[PDB]
Amino acid sequence: HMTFTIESARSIFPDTQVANVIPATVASFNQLSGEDQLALLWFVYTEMGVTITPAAVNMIFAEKTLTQIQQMPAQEQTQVMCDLVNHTDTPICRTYSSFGTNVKLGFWYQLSEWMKQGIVAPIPEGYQLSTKASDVLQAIRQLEPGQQLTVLQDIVVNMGYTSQQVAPRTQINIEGINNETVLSYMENMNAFNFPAAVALFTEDGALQPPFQEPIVGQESILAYMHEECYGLKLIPEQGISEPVEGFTQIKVTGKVQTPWAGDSVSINLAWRFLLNPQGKIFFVAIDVLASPQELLNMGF
């Protein structure tokens, strides 16, 4: 007999208002053809109004592949960027799938810079998207920047073909709760003390990133934290705590800022924790919350 499994833990606070327009838009994007995809991504990225810094984040992992692409003629450069978006089995697509999330993003950032400088073949002057791609572009363009950044990240991480400094903890407050395991988690994540944060989990515990599967076990969670969590700033604001079957479930809402955009952009999140009777994190889900505008729209 078990009171909770990882699977059943995923459904805690089931009426959380998740921004399902994000994966909805990604699914629509994945129905478009390679050329429409690349041109759409160029317009999203360039028209977002957000300055992207690589500086606060990595690139040494991508440099050999980047040099390769830089040396290719324009015809081959564009084909490579089509293999990536189309998920074609190629050496470069397999190498890309081994990059960490932030390495993938740095990869694409450098190509974006080279396209501006005419070192990498640009999107053709005036290339006209299909009507369908034009509808996907406009839905992306309407989203708040932080949600567009999430769309892009999700698309970038899924391209290709699949075959640092610790601060001391500083005090943080969350109105409405007094849970030390939650506060330890948030403060250790802000300090980039990822071994300390992971130590709060049960050995069989999981962390569920937004719109992704649970990452199970401390070794895996730590690797993920190394890959994706450096330079994040977590700004939990408020919470509720409820006892359930001798466990505690805690929902916290607030924001994160990514080092890609600094303090110019804040993404609205929920964190959904299930703690065991000993105060260990059995499960935590992070969700991107729907805006008031998106809730309205996805009714009426």
Ligand X SMILES: CC1=C(/C=C/C(C)=C/C=C/C(C)=C/C=C/C=C(C)/C=C/C=C(C)/C=C/C2=C(C)C(=O)CCC2(C)C)C(C)(C)CCC1
Residues in contact with ligand X by CB under 6 A are 38, 41-42, 45, 52, 105, 108-109, 111-112, 115, 149-150, 152-153, 156, 189, 209-210, 228-229, 232, 234, 256, 258, 260, 267, 269, 286
Chain centroid offset of residue 270 CA: 14
CB 263, min distance to ligand X, A: 14
Three-state SS at 175 = strand
The CB-of-12 to ligand X minimum distance in angstroms stands at 16
Using CA atoms, how far apart are residues 45 and 64, in angstroms rounded to an integer? 24
Q: What is the number of other CB atoms lying within 10 angstroms of the CB of residue 163?
A: 7
Least distance between ligand X and beta carbon 84 (Å): 8
DSSP 51: P
Least distance from ligand X to the Cβ atom of residue 266, Å: 10
By beta-carbon proximity to ligand X, the closer residue of 49 and 246 is: 49
Is the CB of 234 or the CB of 246 nearer to ligand X? 234
CB of 52 or CB of 248, closer to ligand X: 52
Instruction: Tell me the chain's radius of gyration from C-alpha atoms.
Output: 20
Max Cα-Cα span within the chain: 64
Cβ nearer to ligand X, comparing 158 with 241: 158
Per DSSP, the three-state class of 79 is helix
Q: Check: CB of residue 264 under 8 Å from CB of residue 51.
A: yes
Which DSSP string corresponds to 103-167? Answer: HHHHHHHHHHHHHHTTSS--S-TTPPPPHHHHHHHHHHHHS-HHHHHHHHHHHHHT-S----PPP
Given the complex with ligand X, which of 25 and 246 has the nearer CB atom? 25
54: Cβ contacts below 8 Å, ≥ 6 apart? 106, 109, 110, 260
CB of 244 to ligand X, least distance (A): 21
Q: How far apart are CA 181 and CA 197, in angstroms?
A: 9
| Closer of 125 and 245 to ligand X (Cβ) | 125
Q: How far is the CB of 185 from ligand X (least distance, A)?
A: 7
User: C-beta of 225: minimal distance to ligand X in Å?
Assistant: 7
Residue closer to ligand X by CB (options 75, 300) is: 75
Q: In the bound complex, what is the minimum distance in angstroms from residue 19's beta carbon to ligand X? A: 11
Residue 277 burial (CB count, 10 A): 11
∠ CA 198-199-203 to the nearest 5 degrees? 85
Q: What is residue 272's three-state secondary structure? A: strand
Token pair listed for 109:
């950032």
Residue with Cβ nearer ligand X (186 or 248) = 186
